[PDB]
Design a protein that fits this description.
The protein has four domains: 208 residues, no CATH class; 56 residues, Helix non-globular (Single alpha-helices involved in coiled-coils or other helix-helix interfaces); 116 residues, Reverse transcriptase/Diguanylate cyclase domain (Alpha-Beta Plaits, 2-Layer Sandwich), CATH 3.30.70; 107 residues, Up-down Bundle (Mitochondrial Import Receptor Subunit Tom20, Chain A), CATH 1.20.960. Strand 1 and strand 2 form a beta hairpin. With 487 residues, the protein is of the alpha+beta class. The chain is globular and about 65 Å long. The longest helix is centred in the middle third of the chain and has 23 residues. The chain has a six-stranded mixed sheet. A three-stranded antiparallel sheet has the order 10-14-13. Helix content is 42%, strand content 16%. The PDB classes it as hydrolase. The entry lists the keywords hydrolase, nucleotide-binding, nucleotidyltransferase, covalent protein-RNA linkage, polymerase, RNA elongation, transferase activity, mutant, capsid protein, RNA replication, structural protein, protease, helicase, transferase. It forms a monomeric assembly.
Length: 487
Amino acid sequence: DEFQWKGLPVVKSGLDVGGMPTGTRYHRSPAWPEEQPGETHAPAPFGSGDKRYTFSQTEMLVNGLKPYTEPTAGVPPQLLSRAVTHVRSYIETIIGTHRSPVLTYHQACELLERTTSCGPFVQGLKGDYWDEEQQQYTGVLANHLEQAWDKANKGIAPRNAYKLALKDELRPIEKNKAGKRRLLWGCDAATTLIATAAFKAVATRLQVVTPMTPVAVGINMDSVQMQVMNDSLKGGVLYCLDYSKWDSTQNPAVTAASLAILERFAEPHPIVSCAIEALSSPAEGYVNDIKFVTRGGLPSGMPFTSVVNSINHMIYVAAAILQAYESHNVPYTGNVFQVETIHTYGDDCMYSVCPATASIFHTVLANLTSYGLKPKPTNTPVFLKRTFTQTPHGIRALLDITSITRQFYWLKANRTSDPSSPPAFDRQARSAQLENALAYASQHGPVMFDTVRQIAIKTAQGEGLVLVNTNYDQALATYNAWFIGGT
């Protein structure tokens, strides 16, 4: 039965999945004992081990889980259905009406991320279990996937189940001082598998075609695909919005609609449909011996989070716009996604709207907020933290300079309760990281690059590294080869 645990509704899971990991993987660079100008980020608060703060992990979790407790208005069902047929229609004209077959078991298995966790029911990394060249999973994980695959083929859906933790990353110091840390949802590998088999061929068709669809997922921002995106912005009125608390504000009816759109492009099959059932069912987060079941929102670690959230976003925007026209008594004649230009990456976005739409944008925004989303114009495209900028070699999607330099001042390494303690890290990975950071720097041009250069040399001697993209010309040449190659 339900009971309250720190003010959240909560049930015993029948299992014990363990506590959230202790400490942090981030150390200050040994090269960098002092604070540098314009630094804005440091390691998120990790509770008991950490001398900076006095927050506990469990309370940071409870904080992050709270919005999942409260449902969201969503879209009025009649509106929703019109919005949906807009979204569906448009994607039909781009990717066609072909229905992708479900993946084989082995195909689906090869796509799992060996680098990540197995979710709440199996310990370790997925790669712990991968046979490099039996070419299959093995052991306890393989049994976990196998039973699930078998059940799915029999119409029995896997658990929409996540191991809850907190993300360990560099965050804004303003946020750290406030006791904020992002939720980590670790999906059950079986559920990932079934989704993958269901939906990956549809996801791939959308990716092949990016950014011709508003699903920008898997766009290479350091390629021509970004210039295609840029070009598509011309003519319209540019709104680059950030949504707050995007994940906790996802309405489950909208989500179910997005999944129904996806299902349209797949073969009907018991797999496809376990997977909708799982993914449209409420997220269950496991900690210790309890689970929390969501009443609203979406877990950030769902299978296909980006695609599903990009479809949600398309549906919300179509609805907001169509509602705004109808309530102003204006006819809306074309497809939203031709009349308007829309790029999403789950919650990240750029809208380039017709002027008629721009005229009544106040009203669009208000419709968005009425769905329980938490949303003026610019000439400067900003997307996936990139700023679109002219350079001497064409438009580039420029990483923030602080995104570049913070990589020099921090490194992800061994667990610790002390970031000021010395890292154990492999020098080659580190050096490759920093040579990449340098190639990004080169696009900012030569004054900017010289500053980053000086940082990198300092870093190299302090950390004992070796670096070539230390010069502008070779840093420029490496980025360029990335750029024209899709590399």
